[PDB]
C-alpha cells in the first residue's frame with residue numbers, strides 16, 4: 001500500500017534543493033499519501049557536460065526518475081547547461097522540465113523530445129511585439145537579426161505572427177555574429193523607407209549593432225527602437241540608445257518560484273499518470289539498458305496538457321513545442337537614461353500603465369512612422385515599342 | 388620514430404568478432420576493446436576509462452546495435468572533448484539533423500540528401516511519379532522533405548506529390564491520431580522517414596489502413612533498416628530500402644579505412660603545420676585551435692584510389708550504396724547498385 | 732435501405748448537377764476493435780454528409 005515514486009532534479013544550490021524537497025513535502029501533503037508516496041531527489045550541476053550526463057545516469061536515472069528539473073547553475077552557464085541532461089533523460093524519453101532556461105533551441109521537438117519548460121523562449125516575445133504593433137498599428141518595421149538558430153527561430157516566429165495579416169513584410173537584415181562593421185547593413189536599412197528598427201541578437205552583438213546604428217544616427221527622432229531582454233542586459237545596456245523599447249519576462253531570474261510551479265505541474269502530472277494501467281517503471285540504471293522508457297511519451301503527453309491557473313507566474317499552459325503560453329511580460333521604456341515600465345503584457349493584447357511612453361529623441365508623444373515618401377529609384381527594361 | 392595512440396571499441400555482436408583481426412610514416416597504436424552494453428553511461432565511462440594514461444588521440448567506434456542514439460552520443464562526446472570520432476558500422480553510422488561546426492564526428496553512413504536522391508532515382512527507374520511522404524519529427528525529416536521538394540522544383544518531367552504527413556512520436560498513441568493521419572494516404576509510393584522502432588510501430592499501424600498491401604510500395608532511407616541480418620516482423624513485404632555494402636565492404640575493412648583517414652589527416656597537417664592532452668574534464672595544453680586544421684584536413688582524404696572524404700554535414704561524401712528489397716521470405720535481397728554517376 | 736434508395740430515387744430524376752461520392756454502411760452489431768468504422772469514415776471527402 002505505501003508505495004514510493006522517485007523524482008529527479010538538477011538545481012543551482014543546496015538551498016534550491018531544500019526548496020524542492022519542501023515543495024515535494026507540500027505536494028504529498030496536498031495529495032493522498034495512502035495510494036502513492038512522493039520522494040525527492042536532486043543534484044547540483046556538475047563542472048562539465050560529461051560529468052553531468054554521468055550524474056544523470058547514476059544519481060538520477062538509476063534512482064528511477066519520473067522527471068528531471070533543470071535550472072541555471074551558479075555563475076552564468078550561457079543557458080546551454082540543460083542540453084546534456086535533456087539528452088540523457090531524452091534518450092529514455094524521460095520528460096525534462098526547464099525552469100530558468102529561455103533558449104529557443106529547445107523549442108524544436110526534433111533535437112529535444114522530452115524537453116518542456118516553465119518559461120517562454122525568446123522567440124515568443126513576438127507575441128508582445130504583436131500586441132504592441134496591434135494597438136499602435138505600426139505597419140513598417142526592419143527586422144535585424146544575427147545569423148544563428150536563436151535569431152532564426154525568433155525571426156521565424158515573428159514572421160509567422162506577421163503571416164497573420166496578408167503580405168506583411170518590410171526588410172530582412174541577417175548578419176554574422178562578431179561583425180565589427182555593420183555600416184553596410186545599416187546603410188541598406190537606411191535606404192529603406194521604414195524608420196522603425198527591431199533588433200534581435202546577443203548582447204555582445206547588440207553592442208556593435210547599436211554602435212553602428214549610433215554611428216549612422218539611426219537612434220534619433222522619427223525612428224523607433226524595439227528590442228528584447230538580451231539587448232537591454234549586460235554590455236549592451238551601457239551602449240543602449242535613449243527611447244529604446246524592451247521586454248522583461250516575469251520571474252525570469254527566479255528559480256524557486258519556477259521550482260514551485262514545476263513542482264505543482266509535476267504533481268498534477270504524476271497524480272494523473274497513475275490513474276491508468278499498464279504503467280511501467282523507468283530504467284533502474286543506464287548500464288545495460290538500451291531500450292527507452294515506454295511510459296515516457298505518455299507522461300510527456302500528460303505534461304503538455306497540464307493546466308495550472310494558480311501558478312506563481314500566473315496561468316500555466318504549454319504550447320505544442322512545450323514552451324509556456326500566456327506568460328506575463330513587462331514592457332520597458334528608456335527615458336532620461338533610465339528604464340521605465342509603460343505597461344505589461346497579460347493574456348490577450350496589452351494593458352498600458354500610468355507611466356508616460358517615451359520615444360528616442362525625447363519626444364513626449366511621437367508615434368511617427370514610415371516617414372518620407374520621396375524620389376523613387378525606378379528599375380526599368382528595354383522594350384522597343386514602349387521604351 | 389613518431390607514434391600516435393588509437394582506441395578501437397567494438398560492441399558485442401551475434402556475429403563472430405575476433406580482436407586478433409601501408410602503415411604510413413606515422414605509426415598507429417591499436418587498442419582493442421570489447422563492450423557488452425551500448426548504453427550511454429557504459430559508452431561514456433568506458434571511453435573515459437580507456438583514455439586513462441594511454442593518451443589516445445584517435446578513436447574508432449562501431450556497433451551491431453539498431454540504436455540511432457549512438458551517433459548522438461558519439462557526436463556529443465566528440466563535440467565536447469574536441470576529439471576525432473568515426474562511426475563505422477550500425478547505429479554509429481546512422482543519421483542526425485544538424486551538427487555544430489566544432490564537431491569532429493564523422494560517419495561512414497550516406498547523407499540524408501543523397502539517400503532521398505537515391506530513393507527518387509528508384510522512383511524514376513521504376514517510373515513512379517505519384518507518391519506520398521510520411522516523416523516523423525526525428526532529426527533530418529526537414530532535410531528529407533526539403534530534398535524531395537527541391538528535386539520536384541527544377542524537373543521538367545511529370546511529378547506529383549499528393550501528401551506530406553508529419554507524425555509526432557513524442558506522444559503516446561491512444562486517440563490513434565497516427566491512424567487518422569495515415570488513413571488519409573492514397574498514392575502508390577509512400578516515403579517513410581523515421582528510426583527503426585518508429586518504422587516498426589508506423590508499419591504496424593499501416594496494416595490497419597492496408598497501406599502495406601499490394602499496389603503500395605514503400606521507399607525508405609538507410610536509417611530504418613540499417614541491418615540486413617535483423618529484420619522486424621512488422622516490416623511490410625516489398626519494402627525498398629538503401630543499404631551500405633556489407634558483403635562487398637567488410638566491417639574490419641571499415642575500421643581500416645578509419646585508421647587510414649585519421650593517419651592521413653595527421654600526415655597532411657604534418658606536411659603543412661610541421662608539428663595531445665587526453666582527459667574528459669579539461670586540457671591545460673589548449674591546442675583546441677590547432678584541432679580545427681586537423682578537422683579540415685580530415686575532411687579531404689584520398690586513399691588507395693578511392694576517396695573516403697567526408698561531408699560538411701558530418702556524413703561520407705560518396706560511399707557505395709546498394710538498393711535492397713525485402714522478399715516474400717523476409718530477407719533483404721539486393722535489387723540494385725548505385726555508383727557516383729551511373730545508376731545500376 | 733429506404734433512406735439510401737430514396738435519396739438515389741429523388742436524385743435520379745433531378746436535372747440538377749447533384750453528385751454523391753460515397754455510401755458507407757457501418758456495422759454496429761459487432762464491437763469496434765479493428766476500427767473499421769475509422770477506416771471507412773476517413774476515406775470521406777464530400778463537404779456534406781448524410782448520417
Ligand SMILES: C[C@@H](CN1CCC(Cc2ccccc2)CC1)[C@@H](O)c1ccc(O)cc1
Pocket residue numbers: 053084086087088089090091109110111112113114427455456459460461463523524525526556557585
Ligand atoms: C533526438 C532524440 C534524442 N536524442 C538525444 C539524446 C541521445 C542520447 C544521448 C545522451 C547523452 C549524451 C548524448 C546523447 C539520444 C537521441 C529525441 O529528441 C527524438 C527521438 C525521436 C524522434 O522522432 C524525435 C526526437
